[PDB]
Amino acid sequence: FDLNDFLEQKVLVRMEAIINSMTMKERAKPEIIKGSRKRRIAAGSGMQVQDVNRLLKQFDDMQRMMKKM
RNA sequence: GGUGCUGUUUACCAGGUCAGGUCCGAAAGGAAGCAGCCAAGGCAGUGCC
Secondary structure, eight states: OOHHHHHHOOOHHHHHHHHTTSOHHHHHSGGGOOHHHHHHHHHHTTOOHHHHHHHHHHHHHHHHHHTTO
16 A cells, blocks of 8 residues: 555645655655655645645555554 | 667756646736656667767
8 A cells, every 4th residue: 555545545636736746656665755855745746844744644544544454 | 988779777956848736916827846758867788980
């Protein structure tokens, strides 16, 4: 389960945008996403790092939740 | 080294374009621009100078 999947799944249009500013690798191995990349993604989707982090957090709980079944 | 081809590789760090999203504007319209793509570079092999 990676960001590509999470993507499959109102303000949902603003979350797509964020995932849409990522590279393939970032979508596949989300953990590589640190400061500099967030900086790039957020600006690339007219967002803000806090937005990105939120999205990354939602994906995380979605992962952990399935990483327990 | 140059040049051509092929394989491979490259988040942002003043290439082009720019889906999506963002910004400015009452609007008409403007602006920047991620991913992608193209290009370009890196690592090699082959041909030619």
